[PDB]
Amino acid sequence: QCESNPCLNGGSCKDDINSYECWCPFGFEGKNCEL
Amino acid sequence: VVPVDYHLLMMFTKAEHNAPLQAKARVALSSLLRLAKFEAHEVLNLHFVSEEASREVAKALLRELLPPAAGFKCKVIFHDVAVLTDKLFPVVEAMQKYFSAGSGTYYSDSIFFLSVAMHQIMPKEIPRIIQLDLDLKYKTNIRELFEEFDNFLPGAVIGIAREMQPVYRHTFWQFRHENPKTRVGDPPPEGLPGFNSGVMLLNLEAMRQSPLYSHLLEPSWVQQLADKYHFRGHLGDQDFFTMIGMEHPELFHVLDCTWNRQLCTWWRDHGYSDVFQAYFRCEGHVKIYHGNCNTPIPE
Ligand SMILES: *[C@@H]1O[C@H](CO)[C@@H](O)[C@H](O[C@H]2OC[C@@H](O)[C@H](O[C@H]3OC[C@@H](O)[C@H](O)[C@H]3O)[C@H]2O)[C@H]1O
Ligand SMILES: O=c1ccn([C@@H]2O[C@H](COP(=O)(O)OP(=O)(O)O)[C@@H](O)[C@H]2O)c(=O)[nH]1
Numbered sequence: 252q253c254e255s256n257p258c259l260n261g262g263s264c265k266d267d268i269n270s271y272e273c274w275c276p277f278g279f280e281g282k283n284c285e286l
Numbered sequence: 287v288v289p290v291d292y293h294l295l296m297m298f299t300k301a302e303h304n305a306p307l308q309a310k311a312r313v314a315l316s317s318l319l320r321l322a323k324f325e326a327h328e329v330l331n332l333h334f335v336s337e338e339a340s341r342e343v344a345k346a347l348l349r350e351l352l353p354p355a356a357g358f359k360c361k362v363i364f365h366d367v368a369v370l371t372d373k374l375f376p377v378v379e380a381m382q383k384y385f386s387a388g389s390g391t392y393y394s395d396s397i398f399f400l401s402v403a404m405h406q407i408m409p410k411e412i413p414r415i416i417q418l419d420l421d422l423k424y425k426t427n428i429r430e431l432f433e434e435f436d437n438f439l440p441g442a443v444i445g446i447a448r449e450m451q452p453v454y455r456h457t458f459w460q461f462r463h464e465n466p467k468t469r470v471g472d473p474p475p476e477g478l479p480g481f482n483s484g485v486m487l488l489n490l491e492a493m494r495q496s497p498l499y500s501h502l503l504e505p506s507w508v509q510q511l512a513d514k515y516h517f518r519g520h521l522g523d524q525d526f527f528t529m530i531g532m533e534h535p536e537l538f539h540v541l542d543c544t545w546n547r548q549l550c551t552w553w554r555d556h557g558y559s560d561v562f563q564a565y566f567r568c569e570g571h572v573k574i575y576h577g578n579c580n581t582p583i584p585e
């Protein structure tokens with residue numbers, strides 16, 4: 252299995268090859284909504 | 287007497303040298319069998335989907351647990367994951383790209399859709415089967431779950447509990463953004479939070495006999511709905527049932543949360559702090575705990 256994409260856009264798996272933006276749920280920032 | 291068969295099905299694959307999975311299975315099967323009670327003419331059939339090494343592991347665990355204290359007749363059946371994968375693929379191929387990690391269509395993902403085509407995989411002498419995860423702990427007599435089949439309304443084919451985290455709130459983001467009045471992805475009581483696949487009542491007869499359910503399995507229907515909902519997942523059967531359940535809730539008998547009380551809080555810590563409790567709340571006497579996302583189960 253994969254880890255869920257924390258981003259609202261793109262595929263369901265984190266680090267989706269076909270995504271270049273990451274839109275985080277509210278209150279989070281970073282390339283994978285880490286902060 | 288005329289013997290009455292009860293059927294359960296569990297996935298048990300890649301179990302060799304997977305000690306955490308074996309321990310999960312032990313907890314599930316031991317509590318299941320300790321608390322089960324069946325009449326003298328009744329038989330509990332335990333179906334396992336396993337490759338050969340896992341079949342051997344399951345047999346070693348089962349011999350330590352059978353025959354059950356309660357004394358009832360129990361039969362163990364194994365199904366080859368490779369055989370089922372090949373039977374499932376024609377039916378399930380088109381949905382894989384929307385519901386598997388991630389892209390696109392691999393044989394290795396096919397088995398995660400077993401439930402959706404169970405009515406075509408199991409012998410037709412099996413009218414109903416309950417599919418269960420192995421990271422469960424049973425707090426009651428499994429025989430009691432079978433009475434929920436009697437509560438299916440006309441046209442319902444599957445019994446399933448709601449998903450207790452906002453994972454579908456997240457998944458349906460774009461659809462919700464475009465449809466501000468939608469209940470799709472909202473929490474209970476009034477919303478449609480989606481479904482969890484850990485405990486599923488598959489009425490095989492009803493699934494076979496439903497024209498609606500049959501149509502929804504067709505590639506063009508899968509595609510049209512995944513397009514409408516802008517849906518992408520990696521949770522397999524759970525994702526498919528969740529999606530078609532947004533469009534056609536009549537197909538599903540919603541079990542009360544106490545039949546699959548999920549313990550996973552992953553999503554609480556990934557953007558959903560404020561809404562989390564509205565999804566996660568479950569009140570009542572718990573019948574089955576579900577230690578999903580490797581969550582330790584309380585004692
Ligand atoms: C996102 O990725 C994280 C990290 O890998 C997962 O923990 C999340 O999955 C958890 O949260 C949502 C639940 O739906 C999920 O449990 C389901 O998994 C699929 C079915 O096989 C199973 O019966 C069901 O319990 C849980 O693991 C993921 O969304
Ligand atoms: O390597 C694996 C992974 C999963 N499973 C089965 O598939 C179910 C789903 O996985 P798990 O319950 O760990 O995931 P979650 O409930 O968090 O989705 C498990 O209960 C097992 O029955 C398995 O047999 N082998």
Ligand SMILES: [Mn+2]
Binds near residue numbers: 419420421422576579
């Ligand atoms: Mn589980």
